[PDB]
Structures are given as C-alpha cells and as structure tokens.
Amino acid sequence: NSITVRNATFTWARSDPPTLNGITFSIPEGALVAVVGQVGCGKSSLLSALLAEMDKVEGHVAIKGSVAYVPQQAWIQNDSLRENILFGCQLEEPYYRSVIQACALLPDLEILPSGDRTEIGEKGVNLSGGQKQRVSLARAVYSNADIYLFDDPLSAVDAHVGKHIFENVIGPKGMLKNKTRILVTHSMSYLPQVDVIIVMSGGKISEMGSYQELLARDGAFAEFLRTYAS
Ligand SMILES: Nc1ncnc2c1ncn2[C@@H]1O[C@H](COP(=O)(O)OP(=O)(O)OP(=O)(O)O)[C@@H](O)[C@H]1O
Numbered sequence: 001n002s003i004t005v006r007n008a009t010f011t012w013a014r015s016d017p018p019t020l021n022g023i024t025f026s027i028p029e030g031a032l033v034a035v036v037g038q039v040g041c042g043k044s045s046l047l048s049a050l051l052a053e054m055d056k057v058e059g060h061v062a063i064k065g066s067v068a069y070v071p072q073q074a075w076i077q078n079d080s081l082r083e084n085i086l087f088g089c090q091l092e093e094p095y096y097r098s099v100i101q102a103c104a105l106l107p108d109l110e111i112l113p114s115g116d117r118t119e120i121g122e123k124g125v126n127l128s129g130g131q132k133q134r135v136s137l138a139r140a141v142y143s144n145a146d147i148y149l150f151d152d153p154l155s156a157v158d159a160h161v162g163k164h165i166f167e168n169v170i171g172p173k174g175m176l177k178n179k180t181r182i183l184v185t186h187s188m189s190y191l192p193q194v195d196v197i198i199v200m201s202g203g204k205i206s207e208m209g210s211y212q213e214l215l216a217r218d219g220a221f222a223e224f225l226r227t228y229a230s
C-alpha cells in the first residue's frame with residue numbers, strides 16, 4: 001500500500017469540531033481511486049490531510065513516496081508558461097513534449113505569442129479557466145511523483161478535452177498508469193473506470209468498493225449518483 005490511514009481525525013481549527021473524523025482506508029500502490037460525495041463533505045480536506053496540510057488530532061498516516069497535487073482551483077505563477085510547468089525542475093525531452101501533448105496544451109501554445117516562453121499571470125497573457133487547468137495538470141505531471149492527488153481535475157475543461165486528459169493522464173492507458181492516483185470528482189463520467197470508489201459524507205467515509213459493487217448496494221454511492229453527481 002502506498003497510502004495507509006488508520007482511524008485518523010484532522011482539523012483546520014482546534015477551536016471547533018474536526019473536519020475529518022475516524023478516517024480509515026488503504027490504497028494499493030498503483031491503484032486509481034475516486035473520492036466522491038455531496039458538496040462540502042470533505043473531499044478537498046481529505047487531500048489536504050494527505051499533504052500534511054491539516055492538523056492530525058489522532059490516528060496513523062503512512063505515505064510511501066513523493067506526492068503531486070492538482071488543486072481544485074488552478075493557479076498561475078508570474079512567470080513563463082514553461083516555468084509554470086517546470087516549477088524548479090530542468091526541462092528534459094522528450095518527457096516535456098509528452099506532458100505538453102498529454103495535457104492538451106498544443107492548441108493553447110499555438111495561439112501564444114512566444115509559445116511556452118509566453119509570460120502568463122500578472123501583467124502577462126490572460127489565460128482562460130480551461131487553459132489554467134491544463135497548465136496546473138502539466139505542473140503536477142511534469143514532477144513525475146509516485147502519488148497523484150487530483151482535486152476534481154476535469155471540472156474546468158470541456159468534455160472533449162476532459163476525455164483527452166482522462167485517457168492520456170489519469171486512466172489505465174495514460175502516462176501515469178503505474179502511479180497511485182486519487183481522483184476527487186463531482187462527475188459520474190469516469191467512475192466505472194476507476195479501481196475503487198470512496199464515498200464521503202459529513203467528513204467521514206460512508207462506504208468503499210468498485211463502481212459495480214457500490215451501485216448494487218443501493219446505498220450512499222447510489223444516492224450520490226441520483227442526487228449529487230453533476
Ligand atoms: N484550505 C482550507 N483552509 C481552511 N479550511 C478549509 C480548506 N479547505 C477546506 N476547508 C474546510 O473544510 C470543510 C469541508 O470542506 P471541503 O472543501 O473539504 O469539502 P469538499 O467536499 O471538497 O467541497 P466541494 O464539493 O465544494 O469541493 C469546510 O468547512 C471548508 O471550509
């Protein structure tokens with residue numbers, strides 16, 4: 001297991017009840033695992049907890065290897081698009097080329113005045129929400145971590161681009177097919193294709209299993225599909 005969490009409780013503020021309570025799960029190395037649940041149920045917080053960005057009140061957390069993150073709202077550094085991807089790393093080919101292609105960046109680069117050397121962020125070219133998201137994906141993919149935490153990574157891109165990113169970056173035929181990948185998503189579109197789904201409610205885990213297992217149970221996952229998925 002690349003991730004092992006045992007009866008773990010995490011807080012953003014000791015003055016109030018913890019946001020995440022009694023979290024217990026293990027993720028096999030190389031698994032693709034979705035995390036779903038009603039808006040506000042604690043999905044982003046779960047990723048923050050794994051990044052050691054919350055305060056662990058109690059419990060056990062063991063994470064094997066490096067961790068990359070694609071946050072829920074993409075952000076841009078004041079620098080070239082290239083440096084927004086490299087983010088401290090040296091540029092290496094053909095890996096860089098593969099990341100550009102996989103993250104659907106070619107159509108964006110093609111209309112930029114200096115391609116990837118274009119200054120983006122403050123006082124530079126004004127990227128769209130979809131463009132920022134593709135840059136954010138590329139930043140994480142380029143770092144070539146062992147574990148990927150994706151916070152609703154297809155929300156800001158259109159359906160066609162989303163399909164490209166799932167196929168080339170996230171899924172079993174993508175370039176990260178050997179990595180552990182945790183996929184928070186509000187969408188049902190790719191849930192049949194993940195290995196395991198973790199359903200959350202109220203800062204706790206309600207149930208875990210495959211798409212087919214959870215669907216048949218007609219419990220929390222079935223309710224997510226009927227009422228919350230969008
Ligand atoms: N970076 C942060 N700093 C402080 N509090 C946070 C942070 N991120 C989330 N929270 C808090 O955690 C609680 C659960 O919200 P969280 O954002 O984890 O839910 P979510 O399931 O990701 O919601 P959504 O479906 O809207 O993305 C909320 O009180 C929220 O304000």
Ligand SMILES: [Mg+2]
Nearest residue numbers: 043044045072
């Ligand atoms: Mg969230």
